[PDB]
Scaffold this active site. Structure first.
Site, PDB file in Angstrom:
ATOM      1  CB  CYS A   1      63.093  77.710 -43.578  1.00  0.00           C
ATOM      2  SG  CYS A   1      62.734  78.730 -42.155  1.00  0.00           S
TER       3      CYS A   1
ATOM      4  NE  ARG B   1      61.220  79.604 -46.961  1.00  0.00           N
ATOM      5  CZ  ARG B   1      60.861  79.400 -48.224  1.00  0.00           C
ATOM      6  NH1 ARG B   1      61.328  80.190 -49.185  1.00  0.00           N
ATOM      7  NH2 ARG B   1      60.013  78.419 -48.526  1.00  0.00           N
TER       8      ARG B   1
ATOM      9  CD1 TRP C   1      60.108  80.584 -32.986  1.00  0.00           C
ATOM     10  CD2 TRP C   1      61.214  82.538 -32.890  1.00  0.00           C
ATOM     11  NE1 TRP C   1      59.458  81.479 -33.810  1.00  0.00           N
ATOM     12  CE2 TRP C   1      60.119  82.684 -33.766  1.00  0.00           C
ATOM     13  CE3 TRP C   1      62.055  83.637 -32.663  1.00  0.00           C
ATOM     14  CZ2 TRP C   1      59.855  83.874 -34.430  1.00  0.00           C
ATOM     15  CZ3 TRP C   1      61.791  84.819 -33.315  1.00  0.00           C
ATOM     16  CH2 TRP C   1      60.694  84.934 -34.186  1.00  0.00           C
TER      17      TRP C   1
ATOM     18  CD  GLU D   1      62.288  72.840 -35.668  1.00  0.00           C
ATOM     19  OE1 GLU D   1      61.861  73.932 -35.236  1.00  0.00           O
ATOM     20  OE2 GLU D   1      63.437  72.704 -36.140  1.00  0.00           O
TER      21      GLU D   1
HETATM   22  C1  HEM Z   1      62.671  82.194 -36.388  1.00  0.00           C
HETATM   23  C2  HEM Z   1      62.262  80.939 -36.154  1.00  0.00           C
HETATM   24  C3  HEM Z   1      62.412  79.819 -37.118  1.00  0.00           C
HETATM   25  C4  HEM Z   1      61.590  78.736 -37.186  1.00  0.00           C
HETATM   26  C5  HEM Z   1      60.386  78.478 -36.303  1.00  0.00           C
HETATM   27  C6  HEM Z   1      62.072  77.897 -38.235  1.00  0.00           C
HETATM   28  C7  HEM Z   1      61.459  76.683 -38.563  1.00  0.00           C
HETATM   29  C8  HEM Z   1      62.158  75.764 -39.310  1.00  0.00           C
HETATM   30  C9  HEM Z   1      61.870  74.385 -39.281  1.00  0.00           C
HETATM   31  C10 HEM Z   1      60.763  73.797 -38.443  1.00  0.00           C
HETATM   32  C11 HEM Z   1      62.741  73.742 -40.109  1.00  0.00           C
HETATM   33  C12 HEM Z   1      62.786  72.238 -40.385  1.00  0.00           C
HETATM   34  C13 HEM Z   1      63.961  71.568 -39.648  1.00  0.00           C
HETATM   35  C14 HEM Z   1      63.872  70.051 -39.647  1.00  0.00           C
HETATM   36  O1  HEM Z   1      62.766  69.463 -39.783  1.00  0.00           O
HETATM   37  O2  HEM Z   1      64.915  69.355 -39.498  1.00  0.00           O
HETATM   38  C15 HEM Z   1      63.579  74.753 -40.658  1.00  0.00           C
HETATM   39  C16 HEM Z   1      64.556  74.481 -41.585  1.00  0.00           C
HETATM   40  C17 HEM Z   1      65.437  75.463 -41.975  1.00  0.00           C
HETATM   41  N1  HEM Z   1      65.495  76.749 -41.556  1.00  0.00           N
HETATM   42 FE1  HEM Z   1      64.285  77.676 -40.429  1.00  0.00          FE
HETATM   43  N2  HEM Z   1      63.174  78.426 -38.793  1.00  0.00           N
HETATM   44  C18 HEM Z   1      63.432  79.617 -38.193  1.00  0.00           C
HETATM   45  C19 HEM Z   1      64.484  80.517 -38.431  1.00  0.00           C
HETATM   46  C20 HEM Z   1      65.499  80.337 -39.371  1.00  0.00           C
HETATM   47  C21 HEM Z   1      66.645  81.144 -39.546  1.00  0.00           C
HETATM   48  C22 HEM Z   1      66.978  82.358 -38.713  1.00  0.00           C
HETATM   49  C23 HEM Z   1      67.385  80.622 -40.612  1.00  0.00           C
HETATM   50  C24 HEM Z   1      68.666  81.128 -41.169  1.00  0.00           C
HETATM   51  C25 HEM Z   1      69.065  82.411 -41.192  1.00  0.00           C
HETATM   52  C26 HEM Z   1      66.679  79.452 -41.063  1.00  0.00           C
HETATM   53  C27 HEM Z   1      67.035  78.625 -42.114  1.00  0.00           C
HETATM   54  C28 HEM Z   1      66.542  77.310 -42.208  1.00  0.00           C
HETATM   55  C29 HEM Z   1      67.215  76.313 -43.059  1.00  0.00           C
HETATM   56  C30 HEM Z   1      68.433  76.516 -43.931  1.00  0.00           C
HETATM   57  C31 HEM Z   1      66.535  75.158 -42.912  1.00  0.00           C
HETATM   58  C32 HEM Z   1      66.834  73.838 -43.601  1.00  0.00           C
HETATM   59  C33 HEM Z   1      67.714  72.889 -42.770  1.00  0.00           C
HETATM   60  C34 HEM Z   1      67.871  71.549 -43.465  1.00  0.00           C
HETATM   61  O3  HEM Z   1      67.607  71.405 -44.687  1.00  0.00           O
HETATM   62  O4  HEM Z   1      68.286  70.555 -42.820  1.00  0.00           O
HETATM   63  N3  HEM Z   1      65.541  79.336 -40.295  1.00  0.00           N
HETATM   64  N4  HEM Z   1      63.206  76.002 -40.171  1.00  0.00           N
HETATM   65  C1  LIG Z   2      67.144  78.387 -37.494  1.00  0.00           C
HETATM   66  C2  LIG Z   2      66.432  77.235 -37.202  1.00  0.00           C
HETATM   67  C3  LIG Z   2      65.243  77.299 -36.493  1.00  0.00           C
HETATM   68  C4  LIG Z   2      64.579  76.104 -36.216  1.00  0.00           C
HETATM   69  N1  LIG Z   2      63.437  76.154 -35.523  1.00  0.00           N
HETATM   70  N2  LIG Z   2      65.078  74.913 -36.630  1.00  0.00           N
HETATM   71  C5  LIG Z   2      66.257  74.831 -37.282  1.00  0.00           C
HETATM   72  C6  LIG Z   2      66.790  73.619 -37.749  1.00  0.00           C
HETATM   73  C7  LIG Z   2      66.440  72.422 -37.147  1.00  0.00           C
HETATM   74  C8  LIG Z   2      66.979  71.210 -37.591  1.00  0.00           C
HETATM   75  C9  LIG Z   2      67.767  71.159 -38.736  1.00  0.00           C
HETATM   76  C10 LIG Z   2      68.265  69.909 -39.176  1.00  0.00           C
HETATM   77  N3  LIG Z   2      67.540  69.368 -40.334  1.00  0.00           N
HETATM   78  C11 LIG Z   2      67.973  68.010 -40.746  1.00  0.00           C
HETATM   79  C12 LIG Z   2      69.447  67.881 -41.163  1.00  0.00           C
HETATM   80  C13 LIG Z   2      69.671  66.547 -41.543  1.00  0.00           C
HETATM   81  C14 LIG Z   2      69.505  66.165 -42.874  1.00  0.00           C
HETATM   82  C15 LIG Z   2      69.709  64.844 -43.268  1.00  0.00           C
HETATM   83  C16 LIG Z   2      70.085  63.891 -42.326  1.00  0.00           C
HETATM   84  C17 LIG Z   2      70.247  64.263 -40.992  1.00  0.00           C
HETATM   85  F1  LIG Z   2      70.622  63.313 -40.037  1.00  0.00           F
HETATM   86  C18 LIG Z   2      70.038  65.587 -40.604  1.00  0.00           C
HETATM   87  C19 LIG Z   2      68.052  72.353 -39.395  1.00  0.00           C
HETATM   88  C20 LIG Z   2      67.538  73.568 -38.927  1.00  0.00           C
HETATM   89  C21 LIG Z   2      66.895  76.003 -37.651  1.00  0.00           C
HETATM   90 CL   LIG Z   3      66.531  70.181 -33.629  1.00  0.00          CL
END
Ligand code: HEM
Ligand SMILES: Cc1cc(N)nc(-c2ccc(CNCCc3cccc(F)c3)cc2)c1
Ligand SMILES: [Cl-]
Ligand code: HEM
Ligand SMILES: Cc1cc(N)nc(-c2ccc(CNCCc3cccc(F)c3)cc2)c1
Ligand SMILES: C[C@H](O)[C@H](O)[C@H]1CNc2nc(N)[nH]c(=O)c2N1
Ligand SMILES: C[C@H](O)[C@H](O)[C@H]1CNc2nc(N)[nH]c(=O)c2N1
Ligand SMILES: [Cl-]
Lengths: 362, 362
Positions: free
Chosen positions: B65, B68, B237, B242
């Protein structure tokens, strides 16, 4: 002592080499003599065929290279016979000429005598045979910052650069026995350069950007079957992004994005305008356009990635394990638009291969 | 048996939590009772303060993420009191409303009862609370291909989608004891959507693109001190890329680059024209512009990366080790324009954290 490790790597290389060459039955006899020659002499000497194929295997095994599809047609020039700095100089001169080939670039490697006892016979100081100097003194930044230290080392040796942004560095290398390297200015007739213009935007030439035609990496070590070719310059053609997205764009390189934004007529004030991204795209279109227009080989990152996919397919079908460095294979612009981004690669090191080595300057 | 591993993770979490909270002296007594409660009951119950901070630590520890920096102001909603599907539904409804906040998005997490004996109390099927359906039948592709399987599972349960490219999936989740999940249609009044227009190019609206305002991830497990909150949806947000570089651009998603190229008036015939790169940039400018214009929070990849740099600095100065996944932190457009590209990150897993878990459908 070290004949151990030398013998082990020889056994692995020869077996694989002769197998790929369809000469599997000649292995045990070839291995025999080699095992013998190691005992008496402490080393062994590659045949031309072995050396040529080893160089090609090394390229095939370079995890960070997206251009590997054409590994098998690498042009290998065997210069293990050189003894003098004039011969080295002339071999480097010829490499530039033959590889350039009037713009139709030939992937080529010139191989010099290998390390003997760990002792270099020839020590090339240049990062690439053709590369621009860089200066930094009292706030003043000129040329390519990546070349600052080599440039300073050159100027300790009697050379002096004109301090344009595109001073060509001399060839600089040291012979075994000599305490200092020598340097030789590049005949400009040998060096093709490409001025950067844009297909649609006339103002782009106001930037007065240019780059050299042929990247010729001259500071990596070719390792083949326990033999260390520390001096073995090799070239291909550029992938456009290396120039447009990095050399010309990085803040710690030529840092041209703000000026690009200006000549293409967009503001460079707000991140949300994505002005850097737009500038990167137009600069990279300009680079491909310019190389093409001048008749100098180059590949875009999409074609290059498509070729690499074929490299992957070719490996699988030949029953060879594929290795790669994902963090280097992805192009620095639109990476998610290539298949590379969407799969993983085993980053294991397989020999033969090309390796970093310590710089003599610095 | 498993009280072992539960006790170990509790000891680590509480110590770190109470230290960060400035309550280091309360640890041994807090740890005492917990150790006791584990023996008699097989588990322990987080206080509101512990749960809130754990959720924040989990976000801080999410290697992938980029967002963070704002970990410490996450809004935690404690819904461990829910017992019925109506309460779950209403808690999910409220989460959407409060997080959306009329467009000024509040990073929020709603935490439901944790797994007991490894038994889920609540099992959320949605990948995100707001997400578009996808259909694929007899050559025919509609909507979001990433949603095909959940959509099919929904349609086994009596739901039927209108088969537009932007059908909103119902909430779908299963209660402990029930053999089948239930589903509830989303009140449209709660769901903000943003139509994609371009600042300069009027024709862009002919594409009739849109996306939802708030990404609310509802299928990851929050792990805090050995307690498994399998149901704990969280939102932030979007980062523009994305949407513009992936959801709308990937061939296996909405695949819009060719249509983008057409409406911005460039050819999509030659790789060397970099038409995909140009289309990606204009699509991504359109997305940021549209969200801004409608008053819906969003961040561009450059600002997001600058924020992440501050997250790095903040970690160092707080004496906390930094962890990250370079391959995920780099944005899918102009990655070499961010500092992220030019450094490395330790990808070690630190708990508390959010984890993938097996899907109940499929
Ligand atoms: C506040 C605005 C936030 C932005 C702009 C942001 C941005 C991102 C982005 C761009 C990703 C990559 C997702 C992807 O490519 O599929 C991501 C992943 C992630 N974010 Fe954030 N995030 C935010 C807030 C949060 C919050 C509030 C949490 C949890 C409390 C969080 C936890 C995570 C986690 C766990 C992932 C990994 C998901 C995965 O592995 O599939 N994020 N974040
Ligand atoms: C909190 C938050 C903010 C933000 N801007 N984006 C997200 C977010 C977006 C997408 C995802 C999904 N990431 C990929 C999951 C995944 C992993 C492996 C295979 C798949 F088909 C899908 C997780 C978190 C979460
Ligand atoms: Cl998405
Ligand atoms: C034919 C055209 C070629 C193209 C388009 C190509 C493309 C590339 C690119 C784009 C890189 C990344 C460089 C960087 O980002 O700094 C690279 C790295 C590399 N290429 Fe190739 N390459 C080609 C030919 C060759 C040849 C002929 C060899 C050797 C025989 C070679 C061996 C390597 C090696 C060793 C690296 C890694 C350099 C490092 O780690 O710093 N390539 N290639
Ligand atoms: C044969 C060939 C073709 C082509 N298109 N590019 C190259 C090439 C380009 C650049 C490089 C240099 N890579 C980075 C070396 C490096 C590594 C670490 C720190 C540094 F300052 C520099 C190597 C090979 C090589
Ligand atoms: C930190 C990171 O690994 C490093 O800076 C790499 C990233 N990927 C790269 N990829 C290529 N092709 N060239 C590079 O110089 C880099 N830099
Ligand atoms: C193979 C690769 O690791 C994988 O497809 C990743 C690459 N980096 C990514 N980074 C982000 N933010 N999101 C993704 O879906 C991916 N895909
Ligand atoms: Cl280069």
């Amino acid at each position: 002592e070290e004949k151990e490790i030398l013998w082990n790597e020889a056994k692995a290389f020869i077996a694989a080499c002769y197998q790929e060459l369809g000469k599997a039955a000649e292995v045990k006899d070839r291995l025999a003599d080699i095992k013998s020659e190691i005992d008496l002499t402490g080393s062994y000497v590659h045949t031309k065929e072995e050396l040529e194929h080893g160089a090609k295997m090394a390229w095939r095994n370079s995890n960070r290279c997206i251009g590997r599809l054409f590994w098998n047609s690498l042009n290998v020039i065997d210069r293990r016979d050189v003894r003098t700095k004039e011969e080295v100089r002339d071999a480097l001169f010829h490499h530039i000429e033959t590889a350039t080939n009037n713009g139709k670039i030939r992937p080529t490697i010139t191989i010099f005598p290998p390390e003997e006892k760990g002792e270099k016979q020839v020590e090339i100081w240049n990062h690439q045979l053709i590369r621009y100097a860089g200066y930094e003194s009292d706030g003043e930044r000129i040329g390519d910052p990546a070349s600052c230290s080599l440039t300073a080392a050159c100027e300790e040796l009697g050379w002096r650069g004109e301090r344009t942004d595109f001073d060509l560095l001399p060839l600089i290398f040291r012979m075994k026995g000599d305490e200092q390297p020598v340097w030789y200015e590049l005949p400009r007739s040998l060096v093709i350069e490409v001025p950067i213009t844009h297909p649609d935007i006339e103002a782009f030439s106001d930037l007065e950007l240019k780059w050299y035609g042929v990247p010729i990496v001259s500071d990596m070590k070719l390792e083949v079957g326990g033999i260390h070719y520390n001096a073995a310059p090799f070239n291909g053609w550029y992938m456009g992004t290396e120039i447009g997205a990095r050399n010309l764009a990085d803040e710690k390189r030529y840092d041209k994005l703000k000026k690009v934004a200006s000549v293409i007529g967009i503001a460079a004030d707000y991140n949300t305008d994505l002005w850097k991204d737009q500038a990167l795209v137009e600069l990279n279109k300009a680079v491909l356009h310019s190389y093409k227009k001048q008749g100098v080989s180059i590949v875009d990152h999409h074609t290059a990635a498509s070729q690499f996919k074929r490299f992957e397919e070719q490996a699988e079908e030949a029953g060879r394990k594929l290795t790669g460095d994902w963090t280097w294979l992805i192009p620095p612009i639109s990476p998610a638009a290539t298949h590379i981004f969407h799969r993983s690669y085993d980053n294991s090191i397989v020999k033969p291969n090309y390796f970093y080595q310590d710089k003599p300057y610095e």
